[PDB]
Amino acid sequence: GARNSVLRGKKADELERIRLRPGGKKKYRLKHIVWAANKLDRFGLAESLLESKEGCQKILTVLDPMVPTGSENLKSLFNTVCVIWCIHAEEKVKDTEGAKQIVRRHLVAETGTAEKMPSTSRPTAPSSEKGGNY
Ligand SMILES: CCCC(=O)OC[C@H](COP(=O)(O)O[C@@H]1[C@H](O)[C@H](O)[C@@H](OP(=O)(O)O)[C@H](OP(=O)(O)O)[C@H]1O)OC(=O)CCC
């Protein structure tokens, strides 16, 4: 675009506040948007799809399964697309991880009300398995 750019004023704050990592010091910036939008065009996806939250949902759905079966060059874009959606859905996130959760919870909710119910689970092991911070 061009008219007052794409990013807003009040929104630019929260956007510039979000950090790429939970324990890092890097914050999202136009630089990351260019690297992301540039990937879509090349891959085959459009760029305007990053403007509408609805379009972003069609992207995360494809990159979703690409995470557990793809390279880092892809997972990187998947992390950004998750944040772009949180910006248009008025969703607030502290870091990139938080955005990945909120978005996911919103997708599984739509892809879990037709015929994709969860299966039986298993109890924890007797051995020592207590290691993890909040
Ligand atoms: C010329 C090659 C360099 C290049 O292209 O640069 C890649 C660009 C910016 O550079 P970077 O800060 O090194 O990249 C990110 C940080 O190291 C972050 O700490 C790491 O952790 P997490 O966020 O995953 O926890 C990210 O991992 P993946 O998401 O890739 O696994 C990594 O991408 O990545 C972006 O941020 C773009 C938007 C996602």
From Swiss-Prot:
Composition bias of kind Polar residues appears in 118-127
- Annotated spans, Interaction with Gp41: 6-30
Positions occupied by motif Nuclear localization signal? 25-31
Q: Where in the cell is it found?
A: Virion membrane; Host nucleus; Host cytoplasm
Q: Which residues carry this modification: Phosphotyrosine?
A: Y134
> Where on this chain is Nuclear export signal (motif)?
15-21
Domain of life of the source:
Viruses
Q: Topology versus the membrane, per the UniProt entry?
A: Lipid-anchor
Which residue ranges does the record annotate as region Disordered?
Answer: 110-134
Which residues are the lipid attachment points (N-myristoyl glycine)? G1
Question: Which cysteines does the record link by disulfide bonds?
Answer: none
Describe, as the record does, how this protein assembles with itself and its partners.
Homotrimer; further assembles as hexamers of trimers. Interacts with gp41 (via C-terminus). Interacts with host CALM1; this interaction induces a conformational change in the Matrix protein, triggering exposure of the myristate group. Interacts with host AP3D1; this interaction allows the polyprotein trafficking to multivesicular bodies during virus assembly. Part of the pre-integration complex (PIC) which is composed of viral genome, matrix protein, Vpr and integrase.
State what this protein does.
Targets the polyprotein to the plasma membrane via a multipartite membrane-binding signal, that includes its myristoylated N-terminus. Matrix protein is part of the pre-integration complex. Implicated in the release from host cell mediated by Vpu. Binds to RNA.
Protein name as annotated: Matrix protein p17
- The record lists the organism as Human immunodeficiency virus type 2 subtype A (isolate ROD)
Full-protein interval shown? 2 to 135 of 1464
